[PDB]
Chains A and B, each alone.
Chain A
Amino acid sequence: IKAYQAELGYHESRFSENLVMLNLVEFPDIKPGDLVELKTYHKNPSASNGDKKIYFIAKDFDGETKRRAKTSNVSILSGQLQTLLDLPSRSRIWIKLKPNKFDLQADVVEFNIKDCLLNRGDMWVLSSKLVDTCVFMDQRLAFLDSIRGTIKGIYRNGKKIVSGYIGEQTRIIFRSESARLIFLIQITDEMWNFEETGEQLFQKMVNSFFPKIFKKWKDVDTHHTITIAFAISMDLSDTSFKDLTPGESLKNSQDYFRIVVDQVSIIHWVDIMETLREEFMEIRKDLLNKQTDKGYSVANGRFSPVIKSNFLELVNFATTILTDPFKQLDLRHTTTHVMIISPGSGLFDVDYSLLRLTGKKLLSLEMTMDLICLSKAPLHIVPLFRYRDFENKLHHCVPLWLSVFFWNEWTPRCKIYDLQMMGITENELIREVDVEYLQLNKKVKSLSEFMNDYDKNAFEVETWVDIKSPSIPVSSEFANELLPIRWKDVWRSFTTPAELPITISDFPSKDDFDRNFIFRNHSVTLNTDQEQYNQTYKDLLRDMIYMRLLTGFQICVGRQVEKIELSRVVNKYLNDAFKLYLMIDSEIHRITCSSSGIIDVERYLRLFDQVPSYIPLVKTRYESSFRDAMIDPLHVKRESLNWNQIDQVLAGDRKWHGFRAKYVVLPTDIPPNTYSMETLNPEEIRVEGLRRLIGSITRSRLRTEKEKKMFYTGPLYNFINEQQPILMLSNSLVIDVDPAGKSSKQESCTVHYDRVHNPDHCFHIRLEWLTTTPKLIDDLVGNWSRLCERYGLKMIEIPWEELCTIPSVNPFHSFVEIKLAINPWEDPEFKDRELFAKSKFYYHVYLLKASGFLLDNRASKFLQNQDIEFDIMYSWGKPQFKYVQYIHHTGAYVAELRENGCLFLAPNNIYIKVILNFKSTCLDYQKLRSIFLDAKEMWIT
């Protein structure tokens, strides 16, 4: 293959949309659409500019390009590629054509994602658009003209290259610099233990680890949400730690969890570090000063050691927040990465059944537990788990899902605390057992025979991998084998964590497939109502694969899947043959298609009762006392989804729900240009904005291709009986999220909006979506928010679940118990039978209204006066609300009013001073007394 010398020329984006363009007339030997190497070289490595190998795709010029460009052989779009080339105009370069592409497929093409949510199915679709496309380093790609991406690494044959080619077998890896990161600080006895250099390990954690990781996050300009929680195991026995057997955990223990920083963006790193340092200084007083009922506090309690700590309980506490795939969407962040900071060296004594359950749970969800150890690297292979079997047999195992990093000439890698700290006095560790006394043999009758017999005998004598002994090393290939199979296709993990890879090159063997598997079969077909829309079998098929990727399935391509398919073409992206293989730890799905439209889905389905119940004590950010947790961290798990009904509803309903987000619009300040629109009432222009928003939603209705060719004030029951069986308070509508047609699929979502409105009642917008792209939902919400803010409203995003249920779902979330000081039903200063008969919660409602809390549940039966219209229902279902929820007018915080007068209070972390103000107002005699006095004054007058 000859090398073709050529000139250089640039052009603007107004003339062409391609990257590198050639002339097909000038190069008749090069077919269009072929991988063509570009290199400026004279068969020499001329410093750095002489070695510039850049790939592209052979594409011809345009009519305007042919009419304009005459002296330029190659027309390359200006910008990033021009800067990478660093060549002046009309420079002599060379062109080489490679007819083979599969040998030139890059092994790894990285892709960094910022400030947006991209699902794993969206990554799969983006890689489907990158088939047969050449990329180079630091190239800013795009996806639906809103999702940017920088290619920060291209790898081939173990070598990093500036430019590469993306093929079918290209293991493209998507990493996110906008990600949810959880830090679990393992507070033990070794946090205050000194290292050999002279530093306590928490001093390392707060002065060398966290400042450096925040500096590295700012340097790459990542936009994360950190979540830092302490993690304490307290030993309740008086037995010494030297008497503890290796392998057995502590029998009597109490486990604590202090959430320091909640889901907080990393641009507030000063506040994050301040809260972390203050709470770490206060944790000793919080835990080691127990309260005795005699009226005083006794200094009692001991932190457990790292080896005997509650490590699997900490990991299950971390995995609580990923049990449900269909939770609330963090529309600006992508990856959930958990980092465990420990003062140990990767050695943990664990329970066997809990280890099995922890492995089975970690193999079924998208987290990478990156353990970081503040001690030096030990002499054994890390991470090391020691457990005792049912026959009291010691075992050693290295878990695949845990990766250990160490934060930092001979270095002491073995810890002897009593000799480093000189904890044993010199007179009391003097040697007691000495050399033996030269025992005989009872076969020796001579001293020479004894010497001869002494001189003759003087020199005589799938979630873990079982290490035979920590004191014998492992081979190089065994240490290469230690990596998880679901993450087999991957400082970079700390700063820019990676999502679950779209593909896996592993499969159960033929004997294992017939050993512990059961077979379930589907046959799902297009329905005639959805083919009125532009919906064939192909996009429904990739929507099903989109749902599988959302739950956590990876598309199997490799050798074992091919060798098990022929024992009856494997596919990775999307003709009529679409044989994919999708696998999680629970079940494996074989999906095949045809020209008829029937999708054949075969489910190969594959411990929780042999683990004791475990309810720890959890302190959130806004609490002052340790309270019992509302969820078992061990026994909550990723449930096997009822996939038959999922395929049934994507084809076209108890205990089933999709992705969902409740939306609250709220009255706020009016812009001054709005007041120049007939002079109208602010209430009139706000109801005009509400009507405009409702009309904008009903103008967003998804249409077929065939067709494209009440306001009041006061309580709700007063208005119900004023205009006076099921009364629907909401309307049904199926909208088109994307009207510009950026994506190639159908983006349909279901909208429920409130039929009736009060200025004192929150207005509710519902979005029920299954397979829609979340960025389109986010920009639709942004358009609605701009429309509301133009008319003086404020659309804000709110949890769908009730506030009382969030400690039983998300343990890291802030949640506090509010016990008001002045009880109207007990204190005789404010007590009346008639007032409490007319309004049972009058004082609490006035307290919430005086602090700026708008009401959420208008259909509540705790603030009612009469009952009529026996069945009330929303269009999205029945209101399953236990208490009376209240929303702040700024929407940062959510309140809830119980039946006993105690309030709940929790921030709106999805949207995200006033919280502490309201907590101090509720817990002050003077402020609450003044508010209740004002309430009584308003009641009398």
Chain B
Amino acid sequence: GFVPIHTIFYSVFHPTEGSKIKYEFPPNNLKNHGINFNTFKNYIIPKPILCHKLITFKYGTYRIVCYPVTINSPIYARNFFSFNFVFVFPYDCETSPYEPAITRLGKMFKVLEEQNQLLSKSERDPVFFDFSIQDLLMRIFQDLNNYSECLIPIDEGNAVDIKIFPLLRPPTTCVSLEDVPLSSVNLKKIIDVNWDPTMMSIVPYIDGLNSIAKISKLSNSDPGLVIECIRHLIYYKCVTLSDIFQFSNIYAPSSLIRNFLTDPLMASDCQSYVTFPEVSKISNLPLNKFLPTRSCLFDLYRSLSQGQTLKTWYESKYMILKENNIDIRRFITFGLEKRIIYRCYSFPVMIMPKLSDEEEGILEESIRNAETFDKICVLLSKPKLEVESYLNELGEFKVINS
């Protein structure tokens, strides 16, 4: 997860012999590994333009992360005092989780040196002017290499409190109103007092079948804040978006349909998932007026096809689902969650009551943006047939089931 530190050393600018290494843990680690400080001594203690900046450079097989600090005050010799708490890491890693820690260590020691002159007085030599470093470096090194955390008191009111956090990818901006959210975790037990009130309102409505517009209307929430809360839950890797379930939808098998076969726990979970708890009444309705085997579920998952809607597929295969007591919504949801089937979206491209002015405006804007039937149906709060009738009234259109 987190790369161990290779060598920590504290370099200071002596007013007589220039830049030099004061303390270094492990002892003689840089000379044993062929790291020569005089090669990059002008980056460790650079000019004040480069100072107070997170400087990271590559030296051979090692990456050297430092936060140079220069304090200008007439108390010091040569009117300035410069130091650097320098961290050495291997090159083939990610030093991104460690950079805020080193930056805050440098800034905190800058504050302490500006306040009580800690590091300058710790040298015990009155040539820099007009608590142990080595023990602190040992403690920082072993606590960050053994616990990814440290609490090292350096004074009666000062301590080094560093916790290394992982870096997470930002959430996408592709989340929209027609997407339904699927909570991968039990969100009721994560709720503590520090949660946003909007997210706390959204939580009891993420049931895997509610659209973001439906969740916004159910929770009396503005859809933008719901979009941002779903984005924040995406950022913590707990909500995955999906599609509104309709029988007018078109589902087709994906390239991962063989993962129904090459997985020890997908088919058994499908058996325990897609089946009604009892002999449901849907398994008694005619078409017009033991658990199911894994082979039956696979044969039902293959039989989906492009251009064939779920109404046609279900009316072609309804004795199979009735005899095996299979919930078609649960079947489709399990197929989409394991990424073994995908939805072919319907696109009404161009070449009944009187529709309102704002309604016709958003319909025209949705048509000129080549939006799906799902987004238009969400925006007008209408089923697919009313949208199709209004579009046929407005012009001639063709549907792409991509």
Contacts and interface: CB of A to CB of B under 8 A. Distances in A.
A378 B383 contact: no
Interface in B322-366: 327-330, 333
A819 to B, nearest CB: 27
A458 interface: yes
B209 to A, nearest CB: 6
> Which has the most chain B C-beta neighbours within 10 Å: A197, A273, A416, A454?
A416
A604 to B, nearest CB: 40
B207 A207 contact: no
Given A242-B191, A437-B327, A446 B287 contact: yes
B134 to A, nearest CB: 23
Interface stretch (B21-29, B41-49, B164-172): B164-172
A220 to B, nearest CB: 18
B315 A447 contact: yes
Contacts of B104: 198-199, 203, 207
A131 interface: no
Given A211-B114, A241-B193, A410-B171, A438 B107 contact: no
Contact of B185 (A280, A413, A431, A469): A431
A889 to B, nearest CB: 32
A419 B108 CA distance: 28
Given A244-B193, A415-B194, A437 B221 contact: no
Contacts of B176: none
Interface string B160-196: 0111110000110000000000011110011111111
A690 B66 CA distance: 66
A444 B284 CA distance: 11
B306 interface: no
A246 B201 CA distance: 11
B395 interface: no
Most B CB within 10 A of own CB, among A198, A431, A440:
A198
Interface string A186-211: 00001001101111100100011001
Given A196-B165, A416-B236, A469 B330 contact: no
Nearest to B189: A429
B189 A424 contact: yes
A415 B315 contact: no
A731 interface: no
A194 B163 contact: yes
Given A242-B193, A455-B248, A469-B220, A211 B115 contact: yes
A456 B245 CA distance: 12
Contacts of B101: 198
A459 interface: yes
A357 to B, nearest CB: 24
Contacts of B273: 434
A488 interface: no
A203 B185 contact: no
Given A198-B163, A454-B247, A456-B383, A270 B196 contact: no
B293 interface: no
Contacts, number: 226
Interface in B252-297: 273, 276-277, 280-282, 285-289
Interface stretch (A470-478, A541-549, A578-586, A869-877): A470-478
Contacts of A274: 115-116, 157
B156 interface: yes
Given A242-B193, A458-B383, A473-B224, A437 B157 contact: no
A102 to B, nearest CB: 45
A450 B209 CA distance: 17
B93 interface: no
B229 A469 contact: no
Contacts of B194: 190, 193, 305-307, 415, 417
Contact of A440 (B183, B281, B385): B281
A451 B224 contact: no
Interface stretch (B9-17, B52-60, B121-129, B211-219): B211-219
A433 interface: yes
Contacts of A415: 194-196
B323 to A, nearest CB: 14
Contacts of B155: 277
B132 to A, nearest CB: 19
**Which residue, of A270, A412, A444, has the highest number of chain B Cβ atoms within 10 A?**
A412
A279 to B, nearest CB: 8
A914 B304 CA distance: 89
B115 A444 contact: no
B244 interface: yes
A515 interface: no
Given A197-B100, A242-B191, A431-B186, A437 B330 contact: yes
Contact of B288 (A196, A379, A448): A448
Contact of B209 (A203, A281, A436, A444): A436
B319 to A, nearest CB: 11
B143 to A, nearest CB: 15
Interface stretch (B30-38, B72-80, B374-382): B374-382
Interface in A296-332: 305-308
Interface in A452-493: 454-461, 469-473
Contacts of A469: 220-221
Contact of B232 (A416, A429, A432): A416
Interface in B144-161: 153, 155-159, 161
Q: What interface size band does chain B fall in?
A: 35 or more
Contacts of B246: 454-455, 458
A293 interface: no
Given A242-B193, A458-B383, A420 B157 contact: no
A654 interface: no
A471 B285 contact: no
B215 to A, nearest CB: 10
Contact of A471 (B219, B233, B311): B219
A200 B100 CA distance: 12
Contacts of A308: 193
Contacts of A438: 280, 282, 327-330
B228 interface: yes
Contacts of A457: 383
Contacts of B197: 246, 347, 380, 384, 386, 396, 470-471
B198 A470 contact: yes
B5 interface: no
Contacts of B378: 459
A434 B208 contact: yes
B85 to A, nearest CB: 14
Given A276-B157, A414-B196, A198 B165 contact: yes
Interface in A334-370: 347
Nearest to B238: A419
A710 interface: no
B195 A429 contact: no
B235 interface: yes
Given A197-B100, A433-B207, A455-B247, A207 B196 contact: no
B384 interface: yes
B318 interface: yes
Given A431-B183, A438-B282, A471 B220 contact: yes
A456 B384 CA distance: 8
Contacts of B315: 447-448
B235 A471 contact: no
8 contacts: A277-B158, A281-B158, A420-B165, A429-B186, A436-B209, A450-B282, A461-B214, A471-B226
Q: Which 4 A-B pairs have the closest CB atoms?
A: A277-B157, A471-B221, A278-B157, A471-B198
Interface of B: 97, 100-101, 104, 107-108, 111, 114-116, 153, 155-159, 161-165, 170-171, 183-186, 189-201, 207-209, 211, 214, 217-222, 224-226, 228-229, 232-233, 235-236, 238, 244-248, 273, 276-277, 280-282, 285-289, 311, 314-315, 318, 327-330, 333, 377-378, 381-385
Given A379-B228, A436-B329, 20 more contacts: A197-B165, A274-B115, A274-B116, A275-B157, A281-B156, A281-B158, A413-B232, A414-B196, A414-B232, A417-B192, A429-B185, A434-B208, A434-B330, A435-B333, A436-B209, A440-B282, A447-B318, A450-B282, A450-B285, A471-B220
